[PDB]
Amino acid sequence: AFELPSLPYAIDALEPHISKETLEFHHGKHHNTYVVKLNGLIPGTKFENKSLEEIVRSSDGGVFNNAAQIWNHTFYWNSLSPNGGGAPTGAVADAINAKWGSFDAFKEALNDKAVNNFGSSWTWLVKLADGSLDIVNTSNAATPLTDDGVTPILTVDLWEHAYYIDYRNVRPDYLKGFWSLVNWEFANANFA
Amino acid sequence: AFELPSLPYAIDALEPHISKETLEFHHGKHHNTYVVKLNGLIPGTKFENKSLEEIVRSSDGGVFNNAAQIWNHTFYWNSLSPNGGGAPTGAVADAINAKWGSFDAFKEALNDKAVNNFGSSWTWLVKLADGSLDIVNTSNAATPLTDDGVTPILTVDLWEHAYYIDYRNVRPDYLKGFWSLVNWEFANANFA
Numbered sequence: 372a373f374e375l376p377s378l379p380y381a382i383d384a385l386e387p388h389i390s391k392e393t394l395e396f397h398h399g400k401h402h403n404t405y406v407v408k409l410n411g412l413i414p415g416t417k418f419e420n421k422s423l424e425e426i427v428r429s430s431d432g433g434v435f436n437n438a439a440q441i442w443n444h445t446f447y448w449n450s451l452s453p454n455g456g457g458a459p460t461g462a463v464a465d466a467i468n469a470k471w472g473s474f475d476a477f478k479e480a481l482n483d484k485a486v487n488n489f490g491s492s493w494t495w496l497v498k499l500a501d502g503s504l505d506i507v508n509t510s511n512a513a514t515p516l517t518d519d520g521v522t523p524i525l526t527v528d529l530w531e532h533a534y535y536i537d538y539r540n541v542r543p544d545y546l547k548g549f550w551s552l553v554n555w556e557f558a559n560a561n562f563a
Numbered sequence: 564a565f566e567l568p569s570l571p572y573a574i575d576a577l578e579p580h581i582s583k584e585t586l587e588f589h590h591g592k593h594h595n596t597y598v599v600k601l602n603g604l605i606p607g608t609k610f611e612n613k614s615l616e617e618i619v620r621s622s623d624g625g626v627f628n629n630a631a632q633i634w635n636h637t638f639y640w641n642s643l644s645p646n647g648g649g650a651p652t653g654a655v656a657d658a659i660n661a662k663w664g665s666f667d668a669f670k671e672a673l674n675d676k677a678v679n680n681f682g683s684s685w686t687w688l689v690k691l692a693d694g695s696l697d698i699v700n701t702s703n704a705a706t707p708l709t710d711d712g713v714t715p716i717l718t719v720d721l722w723e724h725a726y727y728i729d730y731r732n733v734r735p736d737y738l739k740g741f742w743s744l745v746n747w748e749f750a751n752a753n754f755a
């Protein structure tokens with residue numbers, strides 16, 4: 372049924388911010404496992420011939436947890452780039468300034484939401500129905516893809532497997548890696 | 564102020580099931596952080612002269628997340644022993660037989676509960692008010708200590724930091740390690 376998307380860059384392209392080993396396990400195993408598990412759940416069911424987004428928005432229990440984790444992870448690989456990092460640009464840079472006054476204040480605000488996102492979770496940059504940006508946290512497999520009026524723009528995966536190999540317990544070190552990789556091209560494509 | 568209890572065994576005593584490095588991070592860093600955070604939250608609140616258990620049983624939000632995680636980890640360390648593992652003994656071996664028919668059926672049931680416990684979580688062996696055992700799952704910092712009349716007997720921490728260093732994504736390998744360390748003396752003390 373579903374397939375594991377290719378990573379949008381080479382396996383060592385995010386070094387030294389996220390390691391080759393971390394991509395091998397995180398994409399090659401964790402992401403892959405949600406694809407396998409979902410493909411094992413849907414045969415014969417009403418979800419069999421639906422798209423992944425259709426399934427995320429219409430399921431609960433294990434079908435949701437795997438489908439939403441497939442979507443979220445694909446969204447996360449796209450939120451990183453060997454050519455990202457640095458200051459934001461475009462429409463998204465101006466929208467960050469509009470909501471938080473400055474890029475630096477926005478970074479401080481997302482870092483605080485990310486470090487304190489308790490347990491397995493995701494911290495997101497979203498665009499609300501009034502066109503303004505905000506940061507929201509979700510837990511486990513939950514995702515703003517299911518929230519009316521809310522458009523995902525960027526995400527940071529805070530389940531421990533996302534960073535434990537490279538950073539152990541220090542999420543602030545992982546976030547410094549994320550800011551070095553953040554894909555503003557994908558953020559602007561989503562915003563626009 | 565609350566303090567981090569000493570580990571009940573040497574830093575390499577659970578090898579090769581759980582490594583010295585995992586104990587250094589899990590106990591010396593993760594467990595410690597919850598102590599530190601809770602002590603920061605307590606002054607100026609209704610929790611200033613309360614025992615850890617009184618706090619776990621009467622709080623929510625951050626005070627609960629940190630207090631319950633402190634209690635949970637302390638109980639987890641006691642649930643492992645360099646002299647544990649193997650077949651259960653005494654009163655707990657018999658209760659396991661009464662509830663599940665056999666130790667192997669119990670072990671299959673717990674593994675199934677643990678491997679499927681989604682996200683950061685804990686799997687528990689508990690004694691119900693009716694005197695029988697059962698297996699229950701909790702998410703993030705939640706714990707059966709808040710369930711009136713339920714008595715915790717053993718737990719296995721399933722947050723990824725508990726096993727990622729040693730086993731990466733393979734929880735069943737981690738669970739084989741747990742079965743080689745399980746502390747039946749603590750299980751029996753708790754049951755009795």
Ligand SMILES: OC[C@H]1O[C@H](O[C@H]2O[C@H](CO)[C@@H](O)[C@H](O)[C@H]2O)[C@H](O)[C@@H](O)[C@@H]1O
Nearest residue numbers: 431432433679680681682684700701702
């Ligand atoms: O797909 C299996 C089930 O996964 C979830 O339930 C598991 O994980 C929970 C914590 O996130 C535990 O409380 C629970 O005991 C586990 O079974 C999901 O919520 C269920 O609907 C799924 O069937």
Ligand SMILES: OC[C@H]1O[C@H](O[C@H]2O[C@H](CO)[C@@H](O)[C@H](O)[C@H]2O)[C@H](O)[C@@H](O)[C@@H]1O
Nearest residue numbers: 487488489490508509510623624625628
């Ligand atoms: O102690 C800080 C807070 O921890 C929890 O809230 C954080 O973690 C949640 C996920 O478990 C996120 O959804 C939330 O956005 C974070 O702020 C707790 O629920 C709060 O009450 C605590 O104040």
Ligand SMILES: [Fe+3]
Nearest residue numbers: 401528530533
């Ligand atoms: Fe992940």
Ligand SMILES: [Fe+3]
Nearest residue numbers: 593720722725
């Ligand atoms: Fe833990």
